[PDB]
């Protein structure tokens, strides 16, 4: 055995009962992927993607403080997900690529297809494209890493494509902006975002939902559609589509998201669960409550957002946790969820249990209006920021792996941590 499969079919029963018992028992599993191990350098900008018993990983290592440090290394790797022997899954890396200049690579994203990962990624000499947006050249790079490297074989193991032809429509720029994507047949879909000049953004403020929000003004979401109300651009999430069956390697197409539940363009994720794609979008604006759901159509993109009333994200100012009313802000965090059962929608993710600060990461199995069960991944006072969760099967048992950026209690340096959590069957 020792083989990891995607969640498909009727997995072994999980606990469907809301409980307080400490039935979730996480495993720290980051020791077989030793890339993370470090002593005080800051590791940031994490990427974990899993598909079909393989995975993609990435981080950026900066010398100095996590916020003003200097980029030292960019690592983009791929490997296999296997049972280490005790019926616990763990990541083992097979192929690593180090970009020549770390200061050019931003906002990578990964999609698996037929024994390769493709990591679409943004190239910028002006800085972070989101922060210095009007000057970003707009260029994109496509790396392709083989999950099964072959000895003395080049252009199979690693291959770089320059995307000359970008179909952007009305947008000036498009960009990978999310960890994970899906494959459908021969075509790859990356979570992406588009930069649209605000004065070309057609919106009626009569469409802003100010119901039960006395203190909210109708322009608010029209304004909060960019990082500042002034912003030359607004951001709109969607997908970057890449058809491998296309003759040339140049063309990549943008697909915008529906105007349902529109929220500022956010780090997003499209993934496969139990037979359909589910789409998640981070909340960086007034709609703090989690937004993710089944994908009715990938192109055009329309997402059946769950009316979740229990899961949210922290926010320091003007958009704290549990805010459902339109306001101008650009704050939040990427804590995604991954569906485990669709018959009853039960999903798993690591969320920060705080109103304002980014502390107390908690692994949480929940339905729309209720949280079935929790397990705290660190002390309640522990500061952590971003969580990426993916779930799969191991001997038909549902397992998740969550990457959690966690801060040292004494150092203030942050490092990614890898937890494996088995969803139990029994509620005792």
């Amino acid at each position, epitope marked *: 055995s020792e083989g990891v499969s995607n969640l498909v079919g009727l997995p072994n029963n999980i606990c469907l009962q809301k409980t307080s018992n400490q039935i979730l028992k996480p495993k720290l599993i980051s020791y077989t992927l030793p890339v993370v191990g470090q002593s005080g350098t800051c590791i*940031t*900008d994490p990427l974990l993607a899993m598909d079909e018993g393989y995975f993609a990983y990435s981080h950026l290592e900066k010398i100095g*403080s*996590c*916020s*003003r440090g200097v980029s030292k290394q960019r690592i983009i790797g791929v490997g296999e997900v296997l049972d280490r022997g005790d019926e616990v899954p763990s990541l083992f890396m097979t192929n690593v690529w180090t970009p020549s200049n770390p200061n050019t690579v*931003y*906002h990578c994203s990964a999609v698996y297809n037929n024994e390769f990962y493709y990591v679409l990624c943004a190239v910028s000499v002006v800085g*972070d*494209p*989101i*922060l210095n947006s009007t000057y970003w050249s707009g260029s994109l790079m496509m790396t392709r890493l083989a999950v099964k490297p072959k000895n003395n074989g080049e252009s199979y193991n690693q291959h770089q494509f320059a995307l000359r032809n970008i179909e952007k429509g009305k947008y000036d720029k498009v960009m990978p*902006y999310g960890p994970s994507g899906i494959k459908q047949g021969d075509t790859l879909y990356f979570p992406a975002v588009g930069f649209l000049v605000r004065t070309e953004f057609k919106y009626n403020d009569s469409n802003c939902p100010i119901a039960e929000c006395q203190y909210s*003004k109708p322009e*608010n979401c029209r*304004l909060s559609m960019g*990082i*500042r*109300p*002034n912003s030359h651009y607004i951001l709109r999430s969607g997908l970057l589509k890449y058809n491998l069956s296309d003759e040339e390697n140049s063309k990549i197409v943008f697909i915008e998201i529906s105007d349902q539940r529109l929220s500022i363009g956010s*780090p997003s994720k499209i993934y496969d669960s139990l037979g359909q794609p589910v789409f998640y979008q981070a909340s*960086f604006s007034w709609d703090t409550m989690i937004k993710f759901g089944d994908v009715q159509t990938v192109n055009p993109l329309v997402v059946n957002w769950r009316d979740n009333t229990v899961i949210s994200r922290p926010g*320091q*100012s*003007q958009c704290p946790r549990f805010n459902k009313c339109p*306001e*101008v*802000c*650009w*704050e*939040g*965090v*990427y804590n995604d969820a991954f569906l485990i059962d669709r018959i009853n929608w039960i999903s798993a993710g690591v969320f920060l249990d705080s109103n*304002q*600060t*980014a*502390e107390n990461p908690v692994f949480t199995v929940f339905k729309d209006n209720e949280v079935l069960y929790r397990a705290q991944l660190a002390s309640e*006072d522990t*500061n952590a*920021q*971003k969580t990426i969760t993916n779930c799969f099967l191991l001997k038909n048992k549902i397992w998740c792996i969550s990457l959690v950026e966690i*801060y040292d*209690t*004494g*150092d*203030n340096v942050i490092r990614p941590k890898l937890f494996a959590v088995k969803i139990p069957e029994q509620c005792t």
Partner: antibody, heavy 129, light 108 residues
């Protein structure tokens, strides 16, 4: 060169409303995200009263004062105003106009580091009958 | 709000000394501490941002460190110019909070 200047009565009667107005010269209010009012009682630490959005209607107030405090703006003059009702002698203080700076490092990490990069000279308001 | 307990409230050192002011936070503010200097009848000047970063034009003798809950500003060689009430600003969650300030005096 961007600069601030506070204008105010200097003395307020107890139990009546204090008001102050900051004039911004060297740049428009519509160019900076948040502007704020903060105060320092004599022989005591700095307190942060609250902010107004530079180019939006949004406001945030310190909950020690939220019931009493109203922060407004006049874009035609580059002015923004503080109105602190029902003043107690505890509210005698030097009041500083100030503007806010936000430092970001990554566009997939919207957690700005906040501080105040430009201040006014400060105006003392006394709360005495 | 997050309270900042700054200490010592007062201080006095000869020129050429090393001064250390420290400041703790009710909760964890990772890297979100600003260190300010204010001189009589003037506005506050920012010396340190993001815990350890000297702002341009500020002497090298000013230095800042942090553990998330304890934050220490160090003046390596006190000079006559550096006499002021020094202050904390936690710039993470709103309401923003200031330390109570500490008055560095010089001995002669």
């Amino acid at each position: 060169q961007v600069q601030l200047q506070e204008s105010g009565p200097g003395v307020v009667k107890p139990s009546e409303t204090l008001s102050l107005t900051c004039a911004v010269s060297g740049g428009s209010i519509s160019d900076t995200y948040r502007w704020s009012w903060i105060r320092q009682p004599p022989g005591k630490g700095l307190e942060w009263i609250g902010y107004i959005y530079g180019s939006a209607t949004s406001t945030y107030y310190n909950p020690s004062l939220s019931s009493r405090v109203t922060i407004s703006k006049d874009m035609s003059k580059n002015q923004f105003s503080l109105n602190l009702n029902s003043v107690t002698a505890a509210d005698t203080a030097v009041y500083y106009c100030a503007r806010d700076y936000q430092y970001y490092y990554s566009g997939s990490y919207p957690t700005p580091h906040n501080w105040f990069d430009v201040w006014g000279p400060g105006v003392l308001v006394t709360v005495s009958s | 709000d997050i309270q900042m307990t700054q200490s010592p409230s007062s201080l006095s050192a000869s020129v050429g000394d090393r001064v250390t002011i420290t400041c703790r936070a009710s909760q964890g503010i990772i890297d979100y501490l600003s260190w300010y200097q204010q001189k009589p009848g003037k506005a506050p000047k920012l010396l340190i941002s993001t815990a350890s970063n000297l702002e341009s034009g500020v002497p090298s003798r000013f230095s800042g460190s942090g553990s998330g809950t304890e934050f220490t500003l160090t003046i390596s060689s006190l000079q006559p110019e550096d006499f002021a009430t020094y202050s904390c600003l936690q710039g993470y969650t709103t309401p923003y909070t200031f330390g109570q300030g500490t008055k560095v005096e010089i001995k002669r």
